[model samples]
Target: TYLEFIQQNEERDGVRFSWNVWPSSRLEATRMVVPVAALFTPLKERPDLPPIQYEPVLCSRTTCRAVLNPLCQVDYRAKLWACNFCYQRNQFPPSYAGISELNQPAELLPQFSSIEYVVLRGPQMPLIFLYVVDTCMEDEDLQALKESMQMSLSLLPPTALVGLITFGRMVQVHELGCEGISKSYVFRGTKDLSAKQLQEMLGLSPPPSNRFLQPVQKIDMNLTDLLGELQRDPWPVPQGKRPLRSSGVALSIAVGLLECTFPNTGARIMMFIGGPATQGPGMVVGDELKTPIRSWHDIDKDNAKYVKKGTKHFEALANRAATTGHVIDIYACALDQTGLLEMKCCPNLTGGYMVMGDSFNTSLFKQTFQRVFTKDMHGQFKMGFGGTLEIKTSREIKISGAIGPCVSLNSKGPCVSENEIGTGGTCQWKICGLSPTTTLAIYFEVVNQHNAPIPQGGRGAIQFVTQYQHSSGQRRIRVTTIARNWADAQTQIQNIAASFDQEAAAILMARLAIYRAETEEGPDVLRWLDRQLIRLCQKFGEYHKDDPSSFRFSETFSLYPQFMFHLRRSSFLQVFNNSPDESSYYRHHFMRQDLTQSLIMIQPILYAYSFSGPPEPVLLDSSSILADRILLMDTFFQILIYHGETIAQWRKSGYQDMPEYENFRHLLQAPVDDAQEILHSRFPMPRYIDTEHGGSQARFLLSKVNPSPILTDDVSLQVFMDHLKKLAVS
Candidate 1:
C-alpha cells in the first residue's frame, strides 16, 4: 500500500525520497527513524533513482537548513513550496521562474526518494600501492604470497602504480621501471633510518634508477618475473651462513622506502610478516618474548611490560605514517605471538586493515586478498586514497562521540571547515584513506534549550560530506542529508517501530560494546549488555504492562537479547581465555566492519537440514538440533558445519566409505551451491565438524549456544530467563 499510487509526467524528475513517517507499517521498519535520539542513514542502501547530474539544483529551508526532498509540499499556483523537514514556506529560486509539476527539474521530484550524481572533475592524484613482502617466510608461504599478488595485479585498475620491496636479512627494493634490470638495490643492517638517511640510501637527488615505482601496465611482466625470482629463492645466501632470523626491521624499512618512493602523493603499504622482528629498531627482546598467563589477574600484570613498550613504538611509527598520508595494512602470518600487539599500532592508527593467519594456506590467503579488491555494491571499491569526512547536524544537536578508524577532531571550538567539510558544525575527521566498508558512527546529543524555530511541523537536519581521491585519481565529494522528527513522551514507542533501523542500532551498540569490553571486566561487561536489553524491553513493556514479566518481545527487537548474550562471550570481551593477538584482531575487525557485517557478526544465522527441505532457520540452542540433522553455523568470521550425533555416527559407521557421503561433502563444499547462496561471497567454505569421535572441534559450537561459565555448560535457558527477569526488576 505504500507504493499504491503511481504518476508520470512529460518532464521527468530523477530524484526520489523515502519519508521517515508512515501509518500502518511494522515496527521494525519505522522504529529506527522515530523514538530514537539519533538519525541513521546508509547512503549506499537508498532506493533507486536516476544518476545525479554534474551540477544538480540544491534547495533548502531558509530557516533550518533542511534540503528539499520528494516529501516536500509544492504549490504550482503560488510558485512556493513547503519544506517537509522544517515546514518553512519559500518561493522557488530564480532558476525556477516558471516551474510546474510537469516542467520542473529532476531535483524537485516528489515521487523518488534517493538520487545519485555524476561527480565533476576536480583536483586529483594518482593511486599508488607499495607492497612490502617478507621473503624470509617459509618457501610455502612465500610462494603463496607471490601467487596472490599475481592474481591481485589483474584486479587492479589500469591507472594504478605499484612498487615492490622484499625483506629478509637484507632489504631489496626492485627497480621495476628500469628496462632489462633484474637486480635490486640492497640495504643492510636492522638500524632505523632517518628521512635524510633513507633519501641518501635511495640516491633520490640524482635518481640512481627511475624504476623504483612504475605503472602496473608498463611493468606487469617485469614485476611478475621479479616476484617469481623472489619466490624461488627466498633466501639467496648459503644455508649454513644464512642469518638465524629475519632483520625484523621490515615495517620501519617499508616506511623508509615509502618516503623515498612517493612522499608527496598518498600511497597504501601492504606489509606481510612471517615471524617476529628479531633484528631491528622494533625488534622483540631476545629471539622472542612469550608471556604465559597463570591466572586472570596475572594477564595484565604479565603482559603490561611488553605491551607498553611495543605499543608506544608502533604508535609513534603509525603517527608518522599518518602524517605522511600513508596507509599501511599488515598481513601477519606467524603462529607465534610475533609481537603483533606492538605492530598493530601501525595499521590501527593509519585507518588501515590488519589480518592474521596462523600459517599461510594458499587458498585462504588468496580468497582473502580477492575480497579485499572486490567491488562493493556501488560498483566502486569501498577504499579510496586521501580521504576526509565532516558531519554537521542541526544547530540543536552536538556531536558527543564517534567510533571508527579515524582520529577525532572533537576539541573545543566552533567546528572549522577544512577541505571538503564546508561550515562544519560538529565532527570533523581527516582520514588519509577511506574504504566504503569502513563506517564511522557519530553519536549526537541534543543541546540544552535547543529548538528549531519553525512555525509548523518540521524535522531536524543532518548533513554529511566526504571528500576522497577516487581510484581514477579524481577528487570527489559525497553528500548525504537526513531529516528526522523528534519524538515526545506522548508518542507511543510502538508507533515508531516501523522506522527502527536494525542495522544502525546494531552498529551503534557494537561500537559501545567494543569500548566497554576493552575497558571493563567480563562480569561488568555482562551487566552492561544486560542493562541495554532490559532498557529496550522496558521501553516497550509500557505498552504491555499487564504481562511485564513475560519474556516475549516484538520480532523487531527479538535479536537484542540474543546479540547481547553473544557479545558477553565474544573474544573481544573474554579474558584469560583468548590469546592477546587473536583477541586484538577480532576487536580491530569489529571496529572496521560496516553495519550489515557487524550485525551478522554479533548474531549469526543458523541453518539446519537433512538434505531435503530448504535450509530452515534453527534455534541457536543445541537442543533444537536433532540427532539426524546437519547444522550450518555462520559466525561471519568462520562458517562451521556440525553434524548431529546420529548423523555423525552413521557417516562414520559406513557412509564415510560410500560414494553418497563423499558426494554430499563435495556438494556442500562447492563454491557455487545452495549453501553459498545463503550469504553470498561474504562467507566462503565452512569448517566441517564431525562429532562422532569425541573431538573438541565442537567446543566453539558450545560457546555460541550459551554464554554462562563454561565450567557449567549445563546452565538452563530457564536460568538465563530468570536472570533477565531479575535485571529488569532491578
Candidate 2:
C-alpha cells in the first residue's frame, strides 16, 4: 500500500500525506484530474449489431435502367433472368448511379412493379429455423423436425409463412403456414402419419399459376394433420421403417414460395430444413455439396431401402431456389455428429450454414444469426468490359433496393457503348460511356442479380475492364468482359459469359470438376475454431495479458460462459495493412497473402487452442505468459536436457557463476516446485494435452521455450520477438 501510494500519488520524497479521521480530520484536496479520451468505450454484450433505433440506409429504387426515376416490374417478364456474370446493373458503364458502398458490390434492383413487391416497415416477423437433420435414425429425426415446425409457427410473419418437414417419415410436414395454423397444431400429433399416408400427403401437386414451370402445386396439405398421421406407427413396419419421408414436396413448395417476390422489399429468402444429401433419384446437389454420408439407401443401388424422398426434395428445392432470387439458408442441429462432413455440404450450397454441435452450439447459433441478420450478400467484381452496348434485359435487372443510402454522381457523357432498359432477363446492353482516358470509381448498393439487396458483411472487389471491338469498321471496343468477386457464384457467372464468348464449355466444366474435388475435405475445423477465438479476443482487450503477475491459465476447455465474456482480454490488431511501414514490408516479402491477416488473435491460450486444443492449451498459455511475468525467466530447463540430467543437476551442468542463471536454477529447485505446483493445481497426473490430431487424444505438448504466431506479417513477428525479449528478462 505504501509503495503503491508513493509510486503513484505522492511523488515528492520527504513530505507525505497521511489520512486523518474523526476529530483531527484535515482533508488534503488535490484535484485528481485524468485525461479522458474516446479510447476506452464500455464493453457491450454484442458489438457490430446495430441498436434498436439505429437504421441502416436502404436502397428502395434503381435508376440504372430507368429514365427520370421510372418504375419497372420484375415478375411480369416470362423469361428466366440470367446474367452471364456477376456484374451488377451499376457495374455497367451507362448507369450514373448503380454502385454501392454497402458490402462493396454493384446494386441490382428488382422492380416491385408487380403486386408481389410492396415496401413495408421491415421483415414482418423474421423467423430463423435452427433446422437440424436430427438423426441418422428415422425416429429421432422427427424431434428436431417437430421443434422447427413449432418454432416457425410462433415466429412466422403475417405476410410471410413457414412449414416444417423432416427427411425421414416421407419428409413429415409439421405445420402448413402461419395464416391457418398455430403452435397448438404441432401438439396435435406425430403418431398417425404412416409411410403410405405420408407419401400420399407429399405427392406432387399442381401449380397455382403457369407463369413459371414447377414440379407440382395444386396443394391442399395440412402440416399439423400430416404430423397427426406420423404419431402412430404400425408395429409391423419396424422402428426404422416408420416412413413419413417427403423432401420432394417440401422442395416444390420452397421453390414456389422463395422464387416469388416478397410483399415488402420484393426480396425473397428461403430457409431449407434438412441435412447433407445424395442426389440419387430426382435431385442434384450443388457440385460443391456432394459429400458422402451413410445413407439409409445403399445409394449406389436403385433399390436400396430407407432412401427418403426428403433428401432428394431438399437438394432439388435448394438448386431451384438459387436459380431464382431466393436466398437459401440452412440450419442444422442434426445429432448425427458422425456426419459432420455430410452436414457441412447443405450450407456450402447456398453459402449459409449453422453447425450446432456439442460445445459450439450457442456460439455457433449466435454467430449464425449475426451473420444472417447483418450480412448483405452481393457479387463483387474485380474486372470489367468495354463496348458500345445496347442495353436489353432478358429479365428486369433491378440491383438497388431500399437498404442503404443512395450514391450520387455527375455524368460527363455516355461512353461509346451504353445500357438501356428492357423486358425481363434482358440486360439493356451498353456502349462504353466512360472516355478512354477516364478511370471511373462508382459506389452503389450491391445486390444479387434478382435485385435483392445484399447483407453488410465485408468489403470485396467487383472489378471490370473493356476490350476492342471491330464492329461497323469503327475499330471500337465492345465492352468486352468483367469479373466479379473471385470467390463466389457471381464469379462463375462471369466465367460462363467469358466462356460463351470464348466458347470454352470444356474449361467451365473442368473448373466445376475441380470445385467438386475440393468439397469432400469438409472444413479445416481447427482453422475455423482459430478464427472464432481471434474474434472473441479482439472484442476484449484488457485481460490478464497486460499485467502478467497474477497469471493462471484456465484448465477446462468446456464451452462455458466465456464464449461471450472476456471481451477485453482479446486483441484485434487490424489485419489489413493500413500503415506505410507495413505496405513497404509487404512489398519486400510475399506481396499477396492468403488474407490470413484479416484474422484477430485473442489470448495466447486461445491461440494455442486454435492450433491444438484444450488442456495442452492451458499449459502452453502458462508456459509463455506466466513465466514472463513471474520468474522473468524460462521455467522449463532446456539446458538440462542437453546433458540428460534432471532439474537436480541443472546448475552443475553449466555456468554456476552466472548470477541470472543461478537465480533461475535455484527457483527451479524450490520446495514447492513452481512448474509442478502450477501444473498439478489444475491438471492432475500425467497431464492432459491436445495432440497433433487436436484435442486430448494427441497429448501433444510444445514447451513454451519458443512458440510462434502462424501469421507472416513482419511487424507482428517483430512485436512477438520484442515481447519475448522483455519477457525473458523482465
**C-alpha lDDT values of all predictions:** 0.58, 0.25
List, residue by residue over 1-730, the lDDT tens digit for candidate 1.
2122101210122111222332222233223322222322223433345455554334464334444556567898998887654557867778778788789756566443334445766445557788888766678887878878777776666667788888877777776777754667776645666667878777775222355777787778877776776753344544333222443455666676777666645688888777655555665434423433123354566744445555565777777777677888888776665566667667765777777776665555666677678675656565676555665555444555555566544433332222111112336665666664555665654442313232133455555556566665655555555555644323434444544444456556666667656533334655555556676665543333444366465655666555566556556676557667767777777776655567667777777766566668777786756776677777777766676766666655766567766855642344225445544465222233434224478777777775453111134545555566555544
Candidate 2 deviant stretches above 4 angstroms: 1-157, 172-253, 256-319, 335-349, 356-730
Estimate the overall C-alpha local distance difference test score of candidate 1. Answer: 0.58
Q: What alpha-carbon RMSD in Å does predicted model 1 have with respect to the real structure?
A: 7.0
Per-prediction TM-score to the true structure, in the order listed: 0.78, 0.32
* Clash count list over all predictions: 26, 127
Q: Return the lDDT, model 2, position 37.
A: 6
Instruction: Report the lDDT tens digits of candidate 2 across residue range 1-730.
Output: 3335323221211111111000000110111010000000011112222222212122223322221110211121231122332222212233223333232211222110100111233223222222222222334444434444443333332222333433432332343333354332111112223233433444422212221111111211344344334432232333433223223343344344334422111122323333323222322221122333333233334543323343444455444433332334444443332222222222233323223332213333333333232212222111111222222111111211000001111122221113210111222212211111111111112122332322122112211212212111112212111111211222232221121100111111111222222323223322332333333222212234454333222222112113212111121122122221221221211111111110111212322211122212232233333212112111211101111123225445554456657654443344225334433321001122312212233212233223322222232333433333233222
